[PDB]
Symmetry: C5
Subunit: 332 residues, 5 copies
């Protein structure tokens, strides 16, 4: 039927002659994980190849595609494709290798693989946790240059399809599309790359509850020290100290879960401003206590509400509100 | 006996003609793990295939099935089946491949595999930790469409059997059953899928002890500040502050172990309401202290139990109890 | 010598006739790990098979066993055995497959494998950390029923031997023995199972130091509040609050390391009783403070050691000691 | 040249006759890791075998060794060796299997493998973190007894060489040497084992900084309560309570990182003695406060520095210093 | 075309004669990870080999290189290369083995592999986190000595090329270059090694925010105790105690993430000096309280700002600033 034993398949079709066209269709099954510290993502996809090989021609009367077991794959020539800038990947093998082989009577061949790929994606956290990130997956031939193999999307924009169940708990996925670009290696020649592009957006709610509310609550807990009688030194001092230390703990806990980036994120700006306010509260009380002591000493040697508290009760909330307005007008 | 060398098994029985019927029996051995963060499960099952192949016919006098070693499997045609929407799977191989092959004199073949499959399961945590989840395992042919291969359950509802030792420490497993549905791929044709469905329910006790009791205890520890003399400012302030901070720590610890979902869970509602109560206690004491200071200043310039404490001692417990009644009437 | 090329080894000896006897010897090399959360164990063992095959007969004059390389194994019939209710296992392969093959002149064959098996073991933690657990390893044929293959222990009780270096840092291992039982599958027939049983016991010392001493110390630290003058409210309140919060932290830390079981363990009983005592201390001080305030108000309007402290100093230690006596008489 | 096709290599040289001598040389490349909780170590080594086989003889004129590709290895007889009491091991395979084969004209064969072995090592932590541990790697034949194969060190003591780059960040490695001993299996016969022995010693500095300094600092922080005026009850009570709780946290953190051993380590002795001192400080202050209250009551009914503080200021430091002297004279 | 069946490729070209030259080109694709605790790095690279073999000569008219499938590789002789001092490595295999084979009509052969290598790198942390580290990758032949195979860089310095996307989030990568050196094994002979060298530098910002700012803030929070009236003992004591304990927690958290090195790092110097300052603050207050008590007792028996506070308010900040100036002038 196929006369496999009569041919040497160590050479591509057209060997010694013009390049062989190869078309690609991709269907994305899922996006399994995203790792900010590792700066990568894991995708499961169906990779489909189209090419023609006269050596697989067989007689028939119905002009219909016929399906073979898939162990025949290792006896015939198959296009060499690999994922560029990946960290690890594999082909699923239960209950058998998830490999399809269909051959038409005139030699047209359809080849399909189910693979899982972990690939690198460089992300900019300068607007975290309000950032928008983009990632891509690159498909390129390994052994054959553009002189031997021509790689292209089979149906252009319509070659990429996605399952309706693609979802992430933290990220919104949008704008899947495909592009084509060339690549050059100084010692091997020119290669043709295929691209799968998509965009990711975060949900802010979780970060609000984890960071922004606790810091605001710690700032507001430092303003009750302005309504307590200043004669209660052992009540007013520990309150401010505890609020400062809790703010420090919040900052450390927030920074613990992110990659060790050399630049400043928006959450760092917010937390450090809140910390500054909490610190200023303690300094303000220390000034008040010192001035009261000075006045007592002067009065005895010569023999109400302090203005600082009265003005702080107004100044601190207004400054904090203005800061919040400007911050959330800039970062939105 | 079998004349394997006289036939080409690269083509299915009936090649070029009508589709070949294939029956499936499944026996579930165990459910090994469930991962909320990964949103998958691991199952170990016995997969059994039934079909007929005249090319394996042999003479006999007893009309009995004969068992072969299993290395013969790779010399004959075997149905191509794979698990859909899986993450990883394998066939056990100790001390040999766990593969059974039995052939009847008239060509009927029984084929059995022991496999372990990790498969995806989308779960809704909107009622966590009082949620009920459902999952499924899908069996579909890879290479052959419904025109070449007809896939069905061998005995309908009786095709699925479960071992009595299937058990999870946290989940209750119930309602195993099977269904059949078709699937369509735009470039390859129609396929016939088999389904194994089951339902999972959580045990609430662990979550009660981990989250609900500590938060209630922290709320109740904030009500002892209403029975302490209000003149003890350095005793009443740190108590409320410590309770608020402990409630915050509880909220963070509860959220740490779950997937980063964009929606609200019931435990979040309970914890945030408890946090609100604890915060209000501190605000109440601050109001009491301020009013006492105002009265002292007025009396000196002109020259018991405060009503707020007296009413709070009644109001706070009743509101908390009513909230608990409504919450546990809604979520049950 | 062996005339391997002259025989088809795809059929068992006696094919079509009576069942072939197969004897098993097992020597346990080590117990590598136990996982409470995974509920499994890992064992390394030497598995030895005994059977007769006339097709391997060769002429000789000394009636002595001869050893072959082990690549011959894949050319001859070998009994099909697998481990039941396992999670994963493999055969060691350095520097070659650890497989022995010895054939006697009359056809007697000895076969030996070095394997590592991870197997499930259901454990009851209702008496943790004073529990005693039992586990078993099951050996059964996969392809052949009791009509084709008879599986038995070669020397009965003497078939199981253990290395003197089997040891676990936390568990005491005792009472290795073997049993035999039949198994039935509704669609394949009856099989004969072999069992390896052993018993595990914990060492209590580690758990004493981790849980029982800290909780008792936290309870005893709450009784120093009964010897401090009750006029020191800001000294007596934070002490009780801190002890309650530390007890809560201890409970959470203890529960963190165990599987999410739906039932109550002994350590939970001990910790919750200790927590109750610590909570009652705080309530007792609140009552004392309130009564003192009431008496002061009455005396002013009309114009030592409080009995509660005096009785608590006796009542609390005696109740705690009685609880310890009963607890350690019940759980031993 | 080698006439491989003319011989059956399923039988050892000398099959049916006297045992074949096999010499072993080992060169250690690195020690990769040590795990106290797993009680094992990982070593990378070069394993070299020497034997003679007349079936590989070839004509030559120069009496020189000739090197072959290494795919020839699987066509000839190779000694069967494995590592005893190992957990996992493998042969490196990039860019090809790291296997050397050299054959001399008279049949002498040199065989070399690069392997990585993880092996068990039982360690005694009774003097931790001042302990000295010893470990060994055992090489034994699997299939052949001492009647068929004689295993020995090729050059005795000079057979073991080590790379100068063997180093661990925490451990000092010394005293590599080799020994030989026999082993007996009740069902297979006598085997000859080869041993590689070495000694490990810890660096104390890290443990000093992690445990011993913090505990001493916490003990010294409890002695400042003896210089504060005893009238400051709310200052002296929380200090002692906080020091006790911090010591408890230190003990838990120290125990967290070690295996769950049933016996007592030296660090446990040191930490528990320090804890006892810190606890006694709190009890001492409670006694002082009670006695002051008694004296006040007696004086009123009838109508400086307390001796306990004065003696404690001397007694506590001297006892702690004596304990340190004895502890560091015993454990060195 | 190639007459593979007519030659034995178990012997290198020139077998029995002069050494065969082999050239190497390397292109680095990425640096995937660096592990301080494991002391290794992971690199993905393209390894290219050049050699001549007359046995692969074929007739042609165009003097052009022809590309073969890559399954031919296992039928011909291929140079034996491996990575020295590696921990693990593999060749990527999707969708096929990423192996290129190109043969010129005169027998010149180009061979290319895509591999991932994890290799050891000894690092000195004595200047952490201001350290600069160097690492190298070593390529050496395994089976063949310099008498049989001559290994060299194909284009010298121009043989090493790097992708523009090589980047690490924490480290700056610079100065890629190549060197050549010989290696000697006492039992096998001389080998020729190739080296790939590069330099790594850290970004200080992350460590500043994680360690240096919190410790400075904790030191500055201990200087507010010098502006509070010394009569407030219960306010001034807990402040110093809390600052000391927080500094201890910072030290432990900093040390937790690094390898257990026996020497001192710069961050340890900074943290321990800050801890000393914080401790001295508490000792200073204790001295002040004791002296005040002594003066009170003397005055009663005979019947402002203390100088220590006044001098400490100046001395502590100046000493801390001088320490910072010297530290950051030494470590830069
Ligand atoms: C298949 O090819 C035949 C001619 O060989 C043609 O008549 C028929 O229409 C074709 N069918 C399809 C579906 O292309
Ligand atoms: C899709 O393809 C069409 C036609 O080739 C092109 O105009 C369009 O820009 C493409 N869209 C994207 C997102 O690449
Ligand atoms: C097997 O087939 C024979 C006829 O070939 C029939 O007589 C016999 O009853 C059958 N046995 C079973 C169990 O079906
Ligand atoms: C089982 O099969 C019967 C008959 O086909 C059907 O009536 C019933 O609904 C099925 N049950 C389930 C759970 O699918
Ligand atoms: C081996 O068999 C021979 C007879 O073939 C007998 O004489 C001899 O005693 C036997 N030896 C053993 C050890 O069984
Ligand atoms: C061991 O075997 C003997 C005899 O078969 C039996 O009496 C005994 O009960 C067995 N012991 C165990 C532990 O099974
Ligand atoms: C090799 O053997 C020959 C004799 O066959 C001898 O003359 C020569 O000295 C030997 N060389 C070595 C290095 O042993
Ligand atoms: C090394 O070998 C020599 C001679 O065989 C022996 O005297 C010595 O004790 C050995 N050393 C060790 C450490 O085994
Ligand atoms: C190839 O070799 C031929 C001679 O065989 C020569 O004429 C031609 O210039 C060469 N081409 C290249 C590119 O080296
Ligand atoms: C590169 O090679 C040139 C010439 O061989 C040499 O002078 C130079 O030092 C080399 N550079 C490095 C970094 O090895
Ligand atoms: C998606 C925005 C949510 C804002 C909630 C306050
Ligand atoms: C908040 C600062 C107030 C200053 C009044 C003079
Ligand atoms: C917001 C409070 C203002 C008080 C001014 C006296
Ligand atoms: C299954 C419900 C248990 C409830 C315990 C209070
Ligand atoms: C004095 C009784 C207080 C109760 C608080 C729950
Ligand atoms: C008494 C009201 C205080 C409000 C502080 C936010
Ligand atoms: C709890 C609020 C009480 C208000 C009384 C006027
Ligand atoms: C529950 C306590 C109520 C007190 C009312 C005065
Ligand atoms: C094995 C029992 C030990 C008990 C130590 C108090
Ligand atoms: C003064 C002795 C107190 C004892 C508390 C356990
Ligand atoms: C501990 C309770 C004492 C009650 C005395 C009336
Ligand atoms: C154990 C102390 C008892 C005190 C009774 C007055
Ligand atoms: C190796 C001993 C070091 C001791 C440092 C105090
Ligand atoms: C005032 C000196 C106290 C010393 C405590 C270690
Ligand atoms: C430290 C104990 C002192 C006792 C004096 C009577
Ligand atoms: C070390 C201080 C001793 C004080 C004795 C009065
Ligand atoms: C690269 C140096 C940054 C310094 C920021 C204060
Ligand atoms: C850093 C302490 C400053 C205090 C000013 C009152
Ligand atoms: C900071 C030390 C001051 C000493 C004055 C006598
Ligand atoms: C920096 C404050 C100095 C005060 C000297 C009296
Ligand atoms: Cl206080």
């Amino acid at each position: 039927l196929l006369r496999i034993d009569d041919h040497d398949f160590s050479m591509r079709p057209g060997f010694g002659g013009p390049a062989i066209p190869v078309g690609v269709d991709v269907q994305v099954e899922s996006l399994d994980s995203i790792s900010e510290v590792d700066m990568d993502f894991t995708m499961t996809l169906y990779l489909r190849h189209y090419w023609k090989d006269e050596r697989l021609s067989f007689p028939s009367t119905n002009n219909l595609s016929m399906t073979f077991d898939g162990r025949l794959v290792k006896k015939i020539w198959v296009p060499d494709m690999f994922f560029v800038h990946s960290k690890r990947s594999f082909i699923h093998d239960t209950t058998t290798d998830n490999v399809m082989l269909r051959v038409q009577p005139d030699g047209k061949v359809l080849y399909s693989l189910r693979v899982t790929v972990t690939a690198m994606c460089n992300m900019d956290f300068s607007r975290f946790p309000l950032d928008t990130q983009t990632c891509s997956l690159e498909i390129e031939s390994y052994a054959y240059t553009e002189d031997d193999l021509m790689l292209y999307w089979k149906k252009g924009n319509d070659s990429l399809k996605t399952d309706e169940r693609i979802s992430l708990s933290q990220f919104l996925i949008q704008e899947f599309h495909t592009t084509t670009k060339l690549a050059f290696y100084s010692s091997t020649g020119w290669y043709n790359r295929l691209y799968i592009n998509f965009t990711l957006r975060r949900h802010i709610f979780f970060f609000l509850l984890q960071t922004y509310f606790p810091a605001t609550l710690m700032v507001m807990l430092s303003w009750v020290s302005f309504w307590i009688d200043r004669r209660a030194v052992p009540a007013r001092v520990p309150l401010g100290i505890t609020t400062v230390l809790t703010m420090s703990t919040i900052i450390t806990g927030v920074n613990a879960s992110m990659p060790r980036v050399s630049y400043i994120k928006a959450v760092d700006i917010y937390l450090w401003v809140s910390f500054v306010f909490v610190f200023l509260s303690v300094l303000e009380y220390a000034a008040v206590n010192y001035l009261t002591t000075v006045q007592e000493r002067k009065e005895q040697k010569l023999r109400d509400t302090h203005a600082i508290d009265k003005y702080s009760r107004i100044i601190f909330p207004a400054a904090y509100i203005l800061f919040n307005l400007i911050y959330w007008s800039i970062f939105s």
